[PDB]
């Protein structure tokens, strides 16, 4: 249902509040720079401190000023199925294109835990549905086989597979044949999964350099494999930075550089710390995205 | 401030709310049995899917029902700051002896970040805080430095560490000096930790031998090595088994046998797999708790 580059947006901030006026900015940016889709409210988004209502604000922001001009997918987990489920039906109701569900976070269901809570999302919110798996966040890793049995449920269409292993991808693919489209959610290993199966990638390095990575994207859609690399290798320097620090600290660095955003995070989140800003703009300079 | 035997109480559910009668039986199970605190809307609790009103109606039961005989600690966590300030803030009104608050949870900030987290609460309200890493549940380890430097924030009384690894309840105090208590997060370790300068256990097992609990916390308290240990021994085969799923999945269902509650969880957390009901009605007959 996508593909290619598709921007894990931040959520520009201003003396605590949504920054509406950058937020739009930033959807015309992504418009013209040709990045596939936008998820709004995702992790790279703050999602982990922003109040429901902020959540709500943000994705209608990036709805109502992309005017169906890119699609939008809204990030809308929440940790009781309950409450996952109401949030997911407003993102439908706002006109999301779909809902990206991070699993439940430090709670830890089982398996069968995992099934039911998203067999009941998808039961009740008649909208697309991409699983979103990040252990190394949440303490809880969705099993290809549970991925599998999901991929039966018919509203869930994608996997945003965050765990950067070659062979959580291989497995997924051998088990689900196609039944279910995976997105990689690692920016460091994107490449490699695009060229393997993957149909797009869900990425935190798209928030700064959005031409370079649709275009690796649409390399590997061409099934050019030394082309794809050939970009992948000039943006890892700036893929592992944007990582130096927990995600979206440095992201949010580069981009205040850029003169996109003030660069704001919500405590407990922090501004990059000093001793990283040196590389940082080294890398960002020499892409010539300063 | 505290010591021994503190309970992580299960929030009883009927219904998918608050099971309010069930919990104020369960305030005065503990005062008769002689546990030593009562930690009302902790991870046991099922803060991760209680809404903000439900963990106010929880602690608020609890401290009603307590009627000042046994102390109640608050679970307060939130992962932004200034929402953790207003519901430390709100439990500290209804009376709460301390605030119980883990790290934030899968956004993982830097240590600098949980230091302005900490100390931004400290400062704002004038309630003990007892800190609490989990990071196998929140993908944040609060190091001992970080809580050294939080230790001279003289409202931070305790850290309930959760790792149960010896090193590091030894790297605390060898840091701190007893300018911070420690109090073990983790059943299975819990006697070692009481015997090696640990101040009391906040205890998932407690909630179904409480008597024991408190026994083998009163004897580690009278330097009784031997004894400690020998209730420490009896009580393993449950201490395993109540974290077979993750908890509270078998602890609610123990109480469930025990007819102490509905043993209902919220999803997406399940009741207990039926593969480990033998093992674990085979330990409580043997305890003589059924
Ligand atoms: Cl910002
Ligand atoms: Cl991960
Ligand atoms: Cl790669
Ligand atoms: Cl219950
Ligand atoms: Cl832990
Ligand atoms: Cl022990
Ligand atoms: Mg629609
Ligand atoms: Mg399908
Ligand atoms: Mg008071
Ligand atoms: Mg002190
Ligand atoms: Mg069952």
Known sequence: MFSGSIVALVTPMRNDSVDVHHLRELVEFHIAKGT??????????????????????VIKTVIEQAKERVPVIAGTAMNATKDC????????????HAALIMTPAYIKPTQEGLYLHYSHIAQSVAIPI????????????????????????????????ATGQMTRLQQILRLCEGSIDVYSGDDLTAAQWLLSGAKGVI??????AAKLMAKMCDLAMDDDQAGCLRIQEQLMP?????????????????????????????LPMTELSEKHHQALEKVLKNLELI
């Open 85 to 96: 489920i109401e949030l997911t039906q407003q993102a439908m109701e706002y006109g999301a």
């Open 130 to 161: 991409i699983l979103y798996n990040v252990p190394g966040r949440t303490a809880c890793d969705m099993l290809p086989e549970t991925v599998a049995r999901l991929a039966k449920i018919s509203n869930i269409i994608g996997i945003k597979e």
């Open 203 to 208: 990425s935190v390095t798209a928030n700064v």
């Open 36 to 57: 596939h889709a936008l998820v709004a409210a995702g992790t790279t988004g703050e999602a982990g401190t922003l109040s429901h209502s902020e959540k709500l604000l």
């Open 238 to 266: 700036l893929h592992e930075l944007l990582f130096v620090e927990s995600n979206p600290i440095p992201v949010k660095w580069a981009m205040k550089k850029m003169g996109l955003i003030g660069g704001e995070l919500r």
